[PDB]
Design a protein around this ligand. Structure first.
Ligand SMILES: [Zn+2]
Ligand SMILES: [Zn+2]
Lengths: 698, 114, 56, 135, 194
DNA sequence: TTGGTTTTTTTGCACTATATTTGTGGGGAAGGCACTAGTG
DNA sequence: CACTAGTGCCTAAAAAAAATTTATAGTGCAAAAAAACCAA
């Protein structure tokens, strides 16, 4: 997580908002003219340093973890970034063509570093050199050193965004079925932008209304479709219903069609007020320009937000309406909030990203200040950034030391459990404190929600290593091989998909596609395809060949005629053996053979196959928590592969590498956990961390 | 129970009665187009039904692994291979009836042993 | 569980513990036992505070 | 000076809209190119129903010299190419509407929607397969 | 290969010819085939006009008939950056493309979709047999309007108010009997009669 | 005949209060200028 | 004579991207809308 946050997401977060200009042309017409006094400042490449800290009145030392640890330092390193007039002039008539550094790589602050990260001294040490530096070689683990105290951050699980969900609200309320969408931009302005559509009446007031910012009335969806640019009602019907043969949905839509029977033009529908403010600018009643700017810039911050993709919005909204309508028609059941796959695990990367974004916005706002102040001479470019560096470093230090998460905002929105102090009693405990999770639910707690274990938790989170009391079922612990998703750019994937034959939704038509399959990527609809099978196998083969980052996961919901692609960051996945159904030797067989494992043993005893070297040639494949709903698993490599102690289909695709690996760190110590009652195993898992012994060697 | 739309514009044709000729007419309440009524049927409700069980019967049903396979034969091709699954209508008052589709005959038939 | 064929109601498929502690469980049965234990733990861990309030 | 009404004369010309792969589109959409030079040859069956492209050797054998053109829509309706340029310098009606006039003329009718795909059998082909695999 | 085909190398359009000239793609949403040369009543004018109150706008024939009958600053400011091409696109699209024939029989309103404008490339056969290669900068989509004599916004706002549980199922029929807001073709026909 | 009238019924919304014991330990706690004194 | 720190004195950092989900009870205001009387 940290390595990703350092290599990228930092140059990105800067080059994204590296624009700031004060071109004081004349601040009023003329003044003849005057010159376009551009004050252009922009940030180029950034730089990072090794931990390099000077004391008072002295030279800078090359730090080392033990040095900071005993001297109560912060094992951080500094930063400095490059900073970048020639004009265009215009008196009034003509116009529309009327459009600095003072230093280089100016210091901007210092930020803490992850131990044994890419830029940590220890990440290259040899055991001899490692002892020369005097720290235990068993100290595998990325904690933090703040003011001389080992410091650890903990994962925060959250519901995944940009994904359709439906709920059945309680009977007394005039809403019976609701669908909600969350959104984000990673993570400008936080772009919460909740979208929700409510189904009214039981009463038989069957009508569908939607809530959109900044419109403060419930709006009939037909008006929304018309305002988007779809006038003829039949087209709107085509956007909701897909099997023209079926009718029921049309019957329940009938009242909704009746509601919008009065308006018949797109801008007239746009002319609806939905005021909510702000102060009415140029207006007659409501600018059509205002409405369209809303619907483009702010509406649905996912699939697109620029100017010109009304049709994509229409199709996605119709899809969501259809999903809502199914739940009211009982064709498909209620959504499951507590299913694990539709959650994510925010980690060090994203958290540091959030804090850095906030503090850098504060930075930029302060930069604008004292530049407008210097109406007279001159451009500083030097000294204000020193106080700015103090601010950035102080903010990072405070966040990582206090546990509050955010600036000094009087503990607003500051969930404290983010920067707990690392436990150091037993090596078992220490390891059992790194791979740790936490979610906010409440103070006291409910008793029908995720506290109890879930089926989806299989093989991802240890089913016994939990604390008890007021937090039971909240804190949970990753299983052994479970790994987290660091995300990847989807653009190459979508370009490849389009190249291999895609129907862009701009020219989709249900009539000519009575069986074609929808395609989703990170919860964005992009197109529809005829043959899903060949595309599925091709993507699978290309992944296995190693031409796509294996973290990517795809699912073909053949029952729902759907295809999903996921490449976000924060998913949880586990390894698995791949099983080829075909076999020249006969029935069925998992692809790996004895030669590969012999090579593995030879490589190990050499003191050149790696796990990666197993991955490339297609022998094991990562599986996220979402896919399992489309895979059959064989517990034993011989359970049914061919044709007293204890009690012991033919379409397997993957076999578990070993069952005993569903545990976590602490439970692994328990001998024969099968042969005793589960709560007793939980008692031991919790208790073992309270045992003495050794914790390091140094 | 199907709905017709105006040839001049895709809009729902509302039924309306001929006062003197006493036959139902469908007029496009948007534009002056009017249309004759095929059947005396106007609206259909079906409060309780047993339909929708054949939903999502794709030609690639047999492709997926996770649907279990049985040994019952289809009474068209008699091939013992087949794929079976229970009712698609997810309501508490459903039935334990199953549906057998056979890859060879590509046909769907009930599990009713009667 | 993703190790089973879909739409099965056999006791093993839907979580009947067959074996006894003496021989030892099987992965699935182990998971189900864990589920039951977690249920008991959480229910007591909530009822304690609740019923304390009622008692007071 | 110029008539504001658009020209309807140039309509009667059949047009083939072509979706083009990214690598080849990058080259041909360049403004530096398009000097009028010939770039490739087309092959049409007397029976029809199969169209392939014969690219000239100006590609520097970095991309296939043969491609197959698949008519996604053999028949096309209501699609046309119109060209734009600058001009020379209850009964209540709205007098002012702020018309903005441009010089416009319709120049062709789209009749064939087709896509260029590299023939996998082409010797220079399947190289862009690895190129797309890397990206 | 045996000569079962017509081979001819397609040739590019001259570069110097291209500049100062913009080529766009035109689209109609209609179930029935429409031929602009035949169906439309020449002369036909393409203008970029504001679309507010399209019905109240007089027809080109109507306009011609009317013509014949007549015969402190805050001093401190900061501007957020926006892409220059995006700004130009916004400026160009501030007014929609609207095309009318002289009769006013058929009116169409264009819109811009950026889904596939860049990737698509124009190819039309030259007279010599070459195929003209044009990079298509923008693709515009035109939709019909006012054919069914749409109702106006204000009365619609009054109707949507819950004065009545349901609006009159024959409200449009009654309005057409009153003939309020006649079609642009209808208004042009009335003006020609007068 | 029906709308102004008083009466009633409802709907919302805005309130509070959330078992008992014990022990560490880890944090900081006003920052932001202002006016003068020593040193270069 | 000028620059910066060292200590003492003293009001503001005023920016909005958002509203963020975490319940469940009851129950007294408070206002919103329906429902009876009758009078113009
Ligand atoms: Zn009609
Ligand atoms: Zn059969």
């Amino acid at each position: 997580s940290f390595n990703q946050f350092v290599d990228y997401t930092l140059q990105d977060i800067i080059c994204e908002d590296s624009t700031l200009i004060l071109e004081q042309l004349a601040q009023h017409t003329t003044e003849s003219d005057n010159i376009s006094r551009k004050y252009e400042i922009s940030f180029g490449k950034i730089y990072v340093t090794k931990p390099m800290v000077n004391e008072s009145d002295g030279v800078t030392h090359a730090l080392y973890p033990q040095e900071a640890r005993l001297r109560n330092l912060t094992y951080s390193s500094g930063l400095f970034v490059d900073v970048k007039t020639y004009e265009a002039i215009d008196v009034p008539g003509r116009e529309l063509k009327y459009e600095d550094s003072e230093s280089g790589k100016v210091f901007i602050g210092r930020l803490p570093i992850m131990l044994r990260s890419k830029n940590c001294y220890l990440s290259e040490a040899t055991e001899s050199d490692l002892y020369k530096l005097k720290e235990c070689p068993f100290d595998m683990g990325g904690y933090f050193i703040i003011n001389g105290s080992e410091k650890v951050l903990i994962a925060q699980e959250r519901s995944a965004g940009n994904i359709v969900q439906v709920f059945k609200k309680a009977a007394p309320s005039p809403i019976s079925h609701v669908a909600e969408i969350r959104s984000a931009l990673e993570k400008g302005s936080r772009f919460i932008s909740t979208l929700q559509v409510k189904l009214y009446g039981r009463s038989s007031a069957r009508t569908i209304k939607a809530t959109l910012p900044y419109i403060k009335q419930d709006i009939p969806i037909v008006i929304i479709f018309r305002a988007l640019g779809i006038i003829p009602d039949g087209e709107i019907l085509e956007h909701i219903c897909y099997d023209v043969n079926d009718w029921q949905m049309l019957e329940m839509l009938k009242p909704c069609v009746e509601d919008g029977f009065v308006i018949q033009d797109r801008e007239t529908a746009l002319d609806f007020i939905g005021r909510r403010g702000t102060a009415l600018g140029i207006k007659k009643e409501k600018r059509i320009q205002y409405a369209k700017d809303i619907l483009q810039k702010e509406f649905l911050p996912h699939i697109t937000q620029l100017e010109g993709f009304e049709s994509r919005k229409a199709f996605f909204l119709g899809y969501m309406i259809n999903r809502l309508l199914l739940c009211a028609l009982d064709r498909k059941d209620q959504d499951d909030r507590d299913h694990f796959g539709k959650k994510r695990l925010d980690l060090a990367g994203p958290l540091l990203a959030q804090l850095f974004k906030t503090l850098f916005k504060k930075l930029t706002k302060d930069i604008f200040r004292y530049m407008q102040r210097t109406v007279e001479e001159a451009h500083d470019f030097n000294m204000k950034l020193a106080i700015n560096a103090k601010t950035i470093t102080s903010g990072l230090k405070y966040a990582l030391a206090t546990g509050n998460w955010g600036e000094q905002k009087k503990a607003m929105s500051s969930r404290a459990g983010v920067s707990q102090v690392l436990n150091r009693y037993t090596y078992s405990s220490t390891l059992s404190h790194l791979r740790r999770t936490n979610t906010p639910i409440g103070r006291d707690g409910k008793l029908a929600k995720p506290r109890q274990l879930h089926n989806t938790h299989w093989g991802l989170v240890c089913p016994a290593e939990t604390p008890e009391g007021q937090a039971c079922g909240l804190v949970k612990n990753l299983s052994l091989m479970s790994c987290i998703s660091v995300g990847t750019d989807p653009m190459p994937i979508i370009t490849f998909l389009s190249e291999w034959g895609m129907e862009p939704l701009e020219d989709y038509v249900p009539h000519q596609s009575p069986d074609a399959t929808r395609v989703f990527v990170n919860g964005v609809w992009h197109g529809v395809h005829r043959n899903p099978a060949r595309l599925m196998e091709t993507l699978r083969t290309l992944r296995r060949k190693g031409d796509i980052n294996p973290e990517v996961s795809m699912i073909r919901d053949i029952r729902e005629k759907e295809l999903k692609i996921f490449t976000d960051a924060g998913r949880v996945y586990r390894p698995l053996f791949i099983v080829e159904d075909d076999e020249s030797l006969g029935h069925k067989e998992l692809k790996v053979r004895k030669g590969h494992i012999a090579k593995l043993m030879a490589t190990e005893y050499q003191d050149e196959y790696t796990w990666s070297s197993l991955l490339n040639e297609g022998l094991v494949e990562y599986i996220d928590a979402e896919e399992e709903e489309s895979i059959l698993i064989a517990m034993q490599p011989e359970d049914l592969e061919p044709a007293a102690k204890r009690i012991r289909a033919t379409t397997f695709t993957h076999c578990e590498i070993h069952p005993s690996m569903i545990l976590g760190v602490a439970a692994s110590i328990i001998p024969f956990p099968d042969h005793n009652q589960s709560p007793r195993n939980t008692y031991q898992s919790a208790m073992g961390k309270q045992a003495m012994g050794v914790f390091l060697t140094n | 129970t199907t709905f017709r739309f105006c040839r001049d514009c895709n809009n729902m044709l509302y039924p309306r009665e001929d006062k003197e000729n006493n036959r139902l007419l469908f007029e496009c309440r948007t534009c002056s187009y009017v249309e004759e009524a095929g059947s005396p049927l106007v609206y259909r409700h079906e409060l309780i039904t047993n339909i929708g069980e054949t939903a999502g019967v794709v030609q690639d049903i047999g492709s997926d692994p996770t649907l279990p396979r049985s040994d019952r034969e289809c009474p068209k091709c008699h091939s013992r291979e087949n794929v079976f699954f229970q009712s698609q209508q997810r309501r508490k008052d459903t039935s334990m009836v199953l549906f057998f589709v056979c890859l060879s005959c590509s046909h769907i038939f009930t599990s009713d042993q009667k | 569980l993703p190790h089973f064929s879909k739409d099965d109601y056999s006791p093993e498929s839907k979580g009947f513990v067959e074996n006894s502690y003496l021989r030892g469980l099987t992965p699935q049965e182990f998971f189900f036992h864990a589920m039951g234990g977690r249920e008991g733990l959480i229910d007591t861990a909530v009822k304690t505070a609740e019923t304390g309030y009622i008692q007071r | 000076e110029e008539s504001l009404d658009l020209d309807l004369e140039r309509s009667n010309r059949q047009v083939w809209l072509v979706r083009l792969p990214m690598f080849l589109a990058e080259k041909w959409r360049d403004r530096n190119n398009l000097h009028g030079q010939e770039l490739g040859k087309i092959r049409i069956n007397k029976d029809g129903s199969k169209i392939t492209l014969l690219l000239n050797e100006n590609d520097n054998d970095s991309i296939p010299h043969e491609y197959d053109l698949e008519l996604t829509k053999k028949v096309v309706e209501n699609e046309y190419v119109f060209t734009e340029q600058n001009l020379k310098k209850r009964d209540r009606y709205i007098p002012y509407v702020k018309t903005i006039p441009k010089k416009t003329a319709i120049v062709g009718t789209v009749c064939h929607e087709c896509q260029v795909m590299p023939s996998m059998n082409d010797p220079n082909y399947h190289k862009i397969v690895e190129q797309r695999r890397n990206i | 290969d045996p000569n079962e085909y017509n081979e001819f190398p397609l040739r590019a359009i001259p570069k110097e010819d291209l500049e100062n000239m913009r080529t766009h793609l035109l689209k109609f949403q209609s179930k029935k085939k429409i031929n602009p040369v035949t169906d439309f009543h020449l002369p036909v004018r393409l203008h970029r006009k504001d679309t507010r109150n399209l019905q109240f706008q007089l027809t080109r024939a109507e306009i011609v008939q009317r013509q014949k009958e007549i015969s402190l600053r805050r001093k401190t400011r900061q501007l957020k950056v926006l892409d220059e091409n995006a700004k130009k696109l916004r400026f160009e699209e501030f007014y929609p493309w609207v095309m009318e024939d002289f009769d006013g029989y058929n009116t169409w309103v264009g819109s811009y979709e950026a889904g596939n404008s860049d990737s698509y490339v124009l190819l039309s056969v030259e007279d010599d047999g070459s195929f003209t290669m044009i990079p298509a900068d923008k693709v515009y989509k035109f939709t019909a309007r006012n054919k069914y004599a749409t109702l106006t916004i204000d009365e619609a706002e009054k109707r949507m108010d819950k004065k009545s549980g349901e609006v009159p199922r024959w409200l449009m029929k009654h309005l057409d009997n009153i003939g309020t807001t006649t079609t642009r073709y209808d208004r042009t026909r009335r003006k020609l009669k007068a």
